[PDB]
Structures are given as structure tokens and as C-alpha cells.
Write a protein that binds this ligand. Structure first.
Ligand code: 6Z6
Ligand code: ASP
Ligand code: NA
Length: 389
């Protein structure tokens, strides 16, 4: 009798779950039909509108969250909160790349660094909102440039007392208002996910290695870390951020699923806005546990000496940090890990075909790390938030 109350309460949660079930069924059913590449794009259009909607809100979401969030905290507490984040991010990505290396043993590069330094320091803030540098400015928002600028701006506003308050208040209203619009987007999400995944399925031992490896990291490593740190049941936490994971599986972008990761953690998991505004936008771009595991697996897979296996763990953690929270950013950053060891970069072409499905899974682990990461930081920074009340 207690399942009718579950269906009433979890209406939206189960709808997107059904959207995956119906989407996989529809996609395989429509796959024998030849269609056209143009026709596939037409078919997947309801999934495209969901991407346009989510993408729309990331700019006001990142900028307003970091400016308010860092102004909300004292600069020394921001460093303490920050040290908790960076220490967590680096350990979890090192834990994943080591796990990744173990599983496989059982079964223009300078320009890349310069371009990244260039994006950390945008020469124009208006363009940074829709363009990124690529050696000379390719289309596509500079999330890293804005993340960095907002952090320095947020610290500055906190440091300027009351004169600062007006702009903190301005940006707080702008965050709550964009968060009110993601409530709307969420109802379209089941229709979008169905079409976004059905189109992608309308198109070996390696693919299984990552899939199993991400289950060990995602469902065993990360939860036991959260339990060991907070002493709270981690699988109930994962149930709250479920809509955010199912959307990561659909979009394959951790920057596009950030507004929904915000709605879940803030509400469903009841995490502090002060720390979600701090953790989640930074975690979206730099904390990529699932990508790190995939970088290591693929670098060793194409090879199919220990001091150069040491360079793989260093460059796979390096690529993990660099790679944008945008779909297919994984194999584009494989150039850094393939070059460092000495393997030919042209081998990336062998992976490309199956990569799409692995991307959806590694995005879920990249989001899951930020979700559990915020829960861990919130708990550790208990006193800092206690003081600001
Ligand atoms: C790759 O890009 C990043 C950017 C940020 C961060 C950390 C983070 C998270 N999560 C957030 N929200 O803020 C700060 C972080 C610090 O560790 C340092 C922290 C900080 C505290 C006090 C004064 C600062 C002055 C300048 C920059 C950061 C400062 C801010 C890590 C990597
Ligand atoms: N698409 C992934 C990044 C990657 O492809 O490595 C994400 O946004 O989490
Ligand atoms: Na990254």
C-alpha cells in the first residue's frame, strides 16, 4: 500500500527514469529506419530544446553563485572552505586514476597549456560569457574565466563591507530568480531526456573496463568516503541528487546539469546555499573523477616503464582538471596524456565511435563527486556556517 504514496511523491523522479526506459526502447525501434543525418537532428530536436534551456541558465547561475557565495564568507574562511574543496577534489581524482590504472593492468600540446592560462584571464568579460580562446577565439562560453573572475569579484565585495552589500543583494536576487526558472525547465526534462538519448542510440573490452570501474568508484569508493567523513547514509544522499544524475546521463555535460544539481542539493538533500554556491560551479569544471578514470583507462588501452606509468597518473589528473564540463571534452584532452607518455595522438579515432555512451557515464560520476563533495565540505565547515548566523 506504501508504493502509491511513493508514486504520488516521486512523480517527476520516476517520469525521467521512464523517459530513459522509453527513450532506449524508442531509439532501438527507430534505429533500423535509414532516415538522414539532418533527419536525426530533427528527431532529436525535443532533446535539443532541453539543452538550449539548461545552457541558457548556466551563465547567470555561475556568476551569481560565486559572487554572492564568496561575499557571504570572510576571506580567511573562504580559504579554509577552499582548502577543504581542493584537498577533496585532488584526492578523489587521484583515487580514481589509481583505480583506473589497476583495472586495465588486469584486463600543439604547449598551446593547450597556454590557451588554458589565457582562459583563466579573459581580456573581455562580455565575450567570456559566450566565447573561449583557442590558438583565435572559438565559440562557446568560458566557464573557467567567469568562475575565476566571479571568485576574485566575490572576495572583493566581501572585503568592501556595506558599499559591497548592494551588489551582493543585486546578485542574490539574480540567483534566486534563475533558480526559480530551473523549476520550470525540470518539467520539460522527462520529454527532453527521452529524445536526447533516443537520438544518440540512432547512430569492446575497453568499454566494459570503464563502465565497471565507474561503478566501483561511483557506487563503492565515493559513498564510503562520504560515510567515513559525515557518518550519514550516502545512498540516501544519492537518491536526492538522482534527477541531476539522470540528466547528466542524458545531456553528457556537467555544466548543463549544474542548475539541476543546484535544485537537488539545495532542496532534496538540504545542503547550505552558502557552500553549494562555493563547491558546485568549481566542481563542474575542475572536479572530474569519472573523466580521470577514463583518461587513465584509454591511455593504457591504446598501448595494447613504471616511471612513465607514473607520468600517466600525473597527466590523467592534469587532463581531468583541464577538460571542460562540456560533452566530448574527454577525448579532446587525451592529447595531453598520449603525448606525455609517447603514444601517437591519432589513435584517439579508434575510441570516438563508442565514446558517446562512456561520456554519459563519466559525466554522472563527475557530477556525483561535486554532489557528495558539497555534502562533505558542508559537514567539515560546520563552525564557519555556524558563525555566519
Ligand atoms: C581552478 O579554480 C579553482 C577556483 C577556486 C577554488 C576554490 C573554490 C572551490 N570549490 C572556491 N569556491 O573558492 C575558492 C577556492 C580556493 O581554494 C581559494 C579561495 C580563496 C580564498 C581567499 C582568498 C582568495 C583570493 C584569490 C583567489 C582565491 C581565494 C576561493 C579551487 C579551484
Ligand atoms: N562531458 C563530460 C566531460 C568529458 O567529456 O570528459 C562532463 O561534462 O562531465
Ligand atoms: Na576538468
Amino acid at each position: 500500500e506504501d508504493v502509491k504514496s511513493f508514486l504520488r511523491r516521486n512523480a517527476l523522479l520516476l517520469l525521467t527514469v521512464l523517459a530513459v526506459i522509453l527513450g532506449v526502447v524508442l531509439g532501438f525501434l527507430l534505429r533500423p529506419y535509414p532516415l538522414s543525418p539532418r533527419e536525426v537532428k530533427y528527431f532529436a530536436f525535443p532533446g535539443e530544446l532541453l539543452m538550449r534551456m539548461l545552457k541558457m541558465l548556466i551563465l547567470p547561475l555561475i556568476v551569481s553563485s560565486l559572487i554572492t557565495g564568496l561575499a557571504s564568507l570572510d576571506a580567511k574562511a573562504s580559504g579554509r572552505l577552499g582548502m577543504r574543496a581542493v584537498v577533496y577534489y585532488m584526492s578523489t581524482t587521484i583515487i580514481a586514476v589509481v583505480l583506473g590504472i589497476i583495472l586495465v593492468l588486469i584486463i600543439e600540446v604547449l598551446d593547450c597549456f597556454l590557451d588554458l592560462a589565457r582562459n583563466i584571464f579573459p581580456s573581455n568579460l562580455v565575450s567570456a560569457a559566450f566565447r573561449s580562446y583557442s590558438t583565435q577565439e572559438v565559440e562557446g562560453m568560458n566557464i573557467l574565466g567567469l568562475v575565476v573572475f566571479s571568485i576574485v569579484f566575490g572576495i572583493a565585495l566581501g572585503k568592501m563591507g556595506e558599499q559591497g552589500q548592494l551588489l551582493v543583494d543585486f546578485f542574490n536576487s539574480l540567483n534566486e530568480a534563475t533558480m526559480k526558472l530551473v523549476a520550470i525547465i525540470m518539467w520539460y526534462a522527462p520529454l527532453g531526456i527521452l529524445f536526447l538519448i533516443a537520438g544518440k542510440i540512432v547512430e569492446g573490452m575497453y568499454m566494459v573496463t570503464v563502465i565497471v570501474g565507474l561503478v566501483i568508484h561511483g557506487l563503492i569508493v565515493l559513498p564510503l568516503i562520504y560515510f567515513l567523513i559525515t557518518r550519514k547514509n550516502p545512498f540516501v544522499f544519492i537518491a536526492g541528487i538522482l534527477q541531476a544524475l539522470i540528466t547528466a546521463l542524458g545531456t553528457s555535460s556537467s555544466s548543463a546539469t549544474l542548475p539541476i544539481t543546484f535544485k537537488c542539493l539545495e532542496e532534496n538533500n538540504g545542503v547550505d546555499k552558502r557552500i553549494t554556491r562555493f563547491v558546485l560551479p568549481v566542481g563542474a569544471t575542475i572536479n572530474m573523477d569519472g573523466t580521470a578514470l577514463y583518461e587513465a583507462v584509454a591511455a593504457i588501452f591504446i598501448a595494447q616503464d613504471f616511471g612513465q606509468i607514473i607520468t600517466i597518473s600525473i597527466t590523467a589528473t592534469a587532463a581531468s582538471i583541464g577538460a571542460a564540463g562540456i560533452p566530448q571534452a574527454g577525448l579532446v584532452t587525451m592529447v595531453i596524456v598520449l603525448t606525455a607518455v609517447g603514444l601517437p595522438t591519432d589513435d584517439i579515432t579508434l575510441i570516438i565511435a563508442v565514446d558517446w555512451l562512456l561520456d554519459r557515464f563519466r559525466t554522472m560520476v563527475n557530477v556525483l563527486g561535486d554532489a557528495l563533495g558539497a555534502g562533505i565540505v558542508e559537514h567539515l565547515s560546520r563552525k564557519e556556517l555556524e558563525k555566519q548566523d
